[PDB]
């Protein structure tokens, strides 16, 4: 099966702008396509609703079923100031969402 791509369980676009975030310690990239995963996974049985609802009230970060989440991610090579007044070119893993899927 193919991952799904969406716009304005699917992959939605989202551009991170570090300069707008106030993080000038990152020289490059100032902006990059990062994206995210959102959407439906399984047919929801009516009987499952209170479980889903009670879990959210216990912890909104909790999961009691399938999660729409990245299935493929990519790194980015970034250029940034470190803590010793040096500048580093570092490969930062899992910065870009390439594909979304249900766990």
């Amino acid at each position, epitope marked *: 099966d193919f991952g799904l791509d969406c716009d304005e369980c699917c992959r939605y676009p989202l551009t991170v702008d570090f300069e707008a975030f106030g993080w*000038d310690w990152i*020289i*490059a990239p*100032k902006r990059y396509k990062a994206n995210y995963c959102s959407g439906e996974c399984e047919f929801v049985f009516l009987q499952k609703y209170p479980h889903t609802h009670l879990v959210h009230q216990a912890n909104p970060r909790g999961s009691a079923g399938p999660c729409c989440t990245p299935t493929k991610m990519s790194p980015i*090579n970034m250029l940034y*100031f470190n803590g010793k*007044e040096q500048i580093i*070119y570092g490969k930062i893993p899992a910065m870009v969402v390439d594909r979304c899927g249900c766990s």
Partner: antibody
Amino acid sequence: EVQLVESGGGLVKPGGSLKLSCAASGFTFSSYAMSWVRQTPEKRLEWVATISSGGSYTSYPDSVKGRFTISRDNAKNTLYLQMSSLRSEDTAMYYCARQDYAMNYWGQGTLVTVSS
Amino acid sequence: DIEMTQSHKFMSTSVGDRVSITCKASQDVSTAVAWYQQKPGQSPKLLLYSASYRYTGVPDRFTGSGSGTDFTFTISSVNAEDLAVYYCQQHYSTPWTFGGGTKVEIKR
């Protein structure tokens, strides 16, 4: 058009000080990290200093660290290079450039000569 | 400090020919290499960064390759205006360092 214009270069005695300026136009200056790079009389290119877009972070090679200070005034669209304890080997054409992964839109330079 | 070596200080070409300029880093610098073009009486201009990425507005005839220590800058088909000194630079770790440059001349 993106343009960088350096000034303030000249003849200075060893041990002396000089402040270089770089006037930025045709882009959002506050959104760019900036750098100084020099070209020696032998045509050798040497990185001098880099400053973050907001001005908080700076980096220098050990050759100038403690003698040179890079700074900026975003309201004035100007980059500076304050040089002190000047040495003979600091003689060069000084260029300011925008900094991304690499240096771009280098100005035409300002010449600094260190001699008695 | 990282040393960048451009073994050829001078290269002679004819218009329409392919020119390849090599750059060697003294340490692994991943893909963190830029290439600049300097024409007489002008400041250097950025052509490539991160070894193969063309800077905005750079012609298609300019390409770059390499990863680790060995890097190559290529002009697919030399044009008369390509008479310049080409420099490599590592942007891997400070202090940033440049190659000694390669001057490209045209045959007549």
